[PDB]
C-alpha cells in the first residue's frame, strides 16, 4: 500500500542466443561440402585411373598388333613362304620348315627363308614399338610323340642348334652381311627355348617343325640395365659345333 504505482518497469534483460548449435550446424555444413567435394573428386580420379590403365593397355596392344602387321607385310614382300600369325604372336614356316627322320638341318629354301627373315626382325626391333615393348625371341622345337622320347628331344635340340648356328655362323651369309651392332642386337634377341611335342591329326610331316615366336614386356614391367645383357665386341669368328659327318 505504501509503495508507488508509478514505479520502474522493464527490469528484465534480453537473453543471448546459444551459439553452439549454430557452430555445430555451420561446421557441419563445411564438413558436408568437404565430403561432397571429396566424393566427386575421388570418383572422377578413380574412374580416370581405371580408364587410363585400360587405354594404356589398349594402346600397347594396338602398337604390338601394328608391329606384327608390318612385320608380316615385310615378310610377304621378301618371300611368300613365311607365315606370320598375329593372333598368337608367332612366325612359322609353311613348307620349308618341315623335317624328316634323322634330320637336323633345314632345306635350301628353309635356310634362305631363315637368312631373309632376320633383317626384318632387326627392322622391327629398331622401330619405336620395338624400343618400347620388343622382347627376346625364343625358339621352340617340335617333334612327333611317337618313337623314342630321348631321340626326338636330342634331334629337336640338334635342329635348334643348327638353326642358331646358321644365324651366327661365320661361313653363313648373315655374319658377312650384318654389322657388329646388328650382331649384338641379334645376340640380345635370339636365344634357345624349350622343346614341345604338340602332335595332332597324325600329321608327322607338319608336327616336326621349328618356329620362332615373339614375346613382349608387361604393362607393369620396368625396363632396367640389369636385364640388358651386353655382349663383348666380336674379337674372333664363331665356328659351329656339330659337324657335317654327324
Amino acid at each position: 500500500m505504501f509503495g508507488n504505482a508509478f514505479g520502474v518497469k522493464k527490469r528484465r534483460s534480453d537473453e543471448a542466443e546459444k551459439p553452439f548449435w549454430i557452430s555445430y550446424a555451420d561446421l557441419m555444413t563445411a564438413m558436408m561440402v568437404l565430403f561432397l567435394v571429396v566424393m566427386v573428386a575421388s570418383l572422377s580420379s578413380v574412374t580416370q585411373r581405371i580408364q587410363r590403365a585400360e587405354q594404356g593397355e589398349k594402346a600397347r596392344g594396338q602398337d604390338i598388333s601394328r608391329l606384327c602387321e608390318r612385320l608380316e607385310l615385310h615378310a610377304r614382300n621378301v618371300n611368300k613362304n613365311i607365315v606370320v600369325d598375329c593372333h598368337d604372336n608367332r612366325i612359322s614356316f609353311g613348307e620349308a620348315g618341315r623335317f624328316a627322320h634323322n634330320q637336323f638341318f633345314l632345306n635350301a629354301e628353309g635356310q634362305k627363308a631363315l637368312q631373309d627373315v632376320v633383317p626384318l626382325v632387326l627392322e622391327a626391333s629398331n622401330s619405336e614399338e620395338g624400343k618400347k615393348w620388343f622382347k627376346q625371341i625364343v625358339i621352340e622345337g617340335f617333334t612327333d610323340t611317337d618313337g623314342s622320347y630321348l631321340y626326338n628331344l636330342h634331334l629337336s635340340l640338334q635342329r635348334s642348334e643348327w638353326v642358331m648356328c646358321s644365324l651366327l655362323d661365320s661361313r653363313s651369309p648373315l655374319q658377312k652381311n650384318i654389322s657388329a651392332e646388328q650382331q649384338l642386337q641379334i645376340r640380345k634377341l635370339f636365344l634357345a627355348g624349350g622343346v614341345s611335342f604338340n602332335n595332332a591329326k597324325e600329321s608327322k610331316e607338319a608336327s616336326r617343325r621349328v618356329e620362332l615366336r615373339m614375346q613382349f614386356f608387361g604393362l607393369k614391367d620396368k625396363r632396367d640395365k640389369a636385364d640388358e645383357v651386353d655382349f663383348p665386341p666380336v674379337v674372333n669368328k664363331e665356328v659351329c659345333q656339330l659337324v657335317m659327318p654327324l
Binding site: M1, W21, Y24, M31, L34, F35, I50
Partner: protein, 269 residues
C-alpha cells in the same frame, strides 16, 4: 609461420581413437559436475522447501505470537535466515490492550513473501542455473570440435593412389568416421540428458518454491492501511457528531444548573 606448420604436422599425426576418448572423458567430467553442483543441490532444495511448507502449514491455526516463534525457530538455523528476517520486518503487528497489557492480536502482511524468498536467491544463485542452462551447448561444442577434428583426420588419411588401394583407404576412412561419430554421439546424448534433467529439476524447484511462498502468504492478511484509513474516517464522522452532542448536553446542563441557582436565590430572598 613455421610454428603453425609444426603444430599442423604434429596434430595430423594424432591417433584418431584419442579424440573420442578425450571427448568422452571431458563430457563425463562435465556430467559429473552437473550431477554434483546442480541435480543433487536442486533435489536437496526441493526437499527442504517441501519440509518448510509442511512446517508452515502446521501453524495455520496457531496464535500470531506462537506462529512467529515457530517460524523464527524454523528459519533462524538454515540458509533462509536473512530472507525470513526481512519478511518478518515487513510484517505489521496489531496491538489491542487486554488485561492491562498490549498483546499482538493480529499480524498483517505489507508485502508478498516472494519478494524476500525470491526465485533468484533461493534457486538460481544456489544452483547456478544461469550457467547450467548453457551446459548442453557446451557439450554440443565439445562434440562438434571432436567430430570435425576426427573427420578431418580421416579425410587427410584418405588418398587412393591407385584403384587397387581403394578398399583399404575406404576401410580406414570408415574406422576414422566411426571414431568421430562416437565422440559426437556421446556428446549430443549427454547434452540432451542434461537438458532433460535440468529442466525437470528447475520446474519442480519453481513449483515447490511457489508452494512455499504461497504457504507463507496465507498466514497474514494485507490491507491494514486501508482499514486504518476507514477507521480514521469513521472516527472523524462520530467525532463531529460527538462534538455537537457534547455542546448540546453542556448547554442543557448549564440551563438546568442556572435554573437551580435562580431557585436557590429565590428561596434565600
Amino acid at each position: 609461420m613455421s610454428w603453425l606448420n609444426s603444430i599442423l604436422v604434429t596434430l595430423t599425426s594424432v591417433e584418431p581413437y584419442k579424440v573420442p576418448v578425450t571427448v568422452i572423458v571431458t563430457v563425463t567430467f562435465a556430467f559429473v559436475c552437473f550431477i554434483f553442483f546442480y541435480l543433487l543441490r536442486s533435489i536437496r532444495i526441493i526437499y527442504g522447501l517441501k519440509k518448510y511448507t509442511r512446517s508452515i502449514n502446521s501453524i495455520e491455526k496457531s496464535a500470531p505470537e506462537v506462529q512467529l516463534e515457530h517460524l523464527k525457530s524454523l528459519f533462524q538455523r538454515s540458509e533462509l535466515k536473512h530472507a525470513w528476517n526481512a519478511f518478518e520486518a515487513s510484517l505489521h503487528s496489531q496491538y489491542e490492550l487486554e488485561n492491562g497489557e498490549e498483546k499482538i492480536v493480529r499480524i498483517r502482511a505489507t508485502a508478498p513473501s516472494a519478494s524476500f524468498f525470491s526465485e533468484q536467491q533461493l534457486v538460481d544463485i544456489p544452483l547456478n542455473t544461469e550457467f547450467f542452462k548453457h551446459l548442453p551447448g557446451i557439450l554440443t561444442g565439445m562434440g562438434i570440435i571432436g567430430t570435425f577434428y576426427g573427420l578431418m583426420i580421416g579425410l587427410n588419411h584418405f588418398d587412393p593412389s591407385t584403384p587397387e588401394q581403394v578398399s583399404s583407404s575406404v576401410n580406414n576412412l570408415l574406422r576414422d568416421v566411426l571414431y568421430a561419430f562416437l565422440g559426437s554421439a556421446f556428446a549430443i546424448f549427454a547434452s540432451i540428458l542434461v537438458t532433460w534433467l535440468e529442466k525437470l529439476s528447475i520446474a519442480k524447484s519453481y513449483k515447490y518454491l511457489e508452494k512455499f511462498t504461497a504457504a507463507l502468504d496465507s498466514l497474514y492478511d494485507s490491507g491494514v492501511g486501508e482499514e486504518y484509513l476507514a477507521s480514521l474516517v469513521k472516527s472523524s464522522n462520530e467525532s463531529a457528531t460527538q462534538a455537537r452532542h457534547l455542546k448540546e448536553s453542556l448547554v442543557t446542563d448549564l440551563r438546568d444548573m442556572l435554573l437551580h441557582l435562580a431557585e436557590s436565590q429565590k428561596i434565600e430572598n
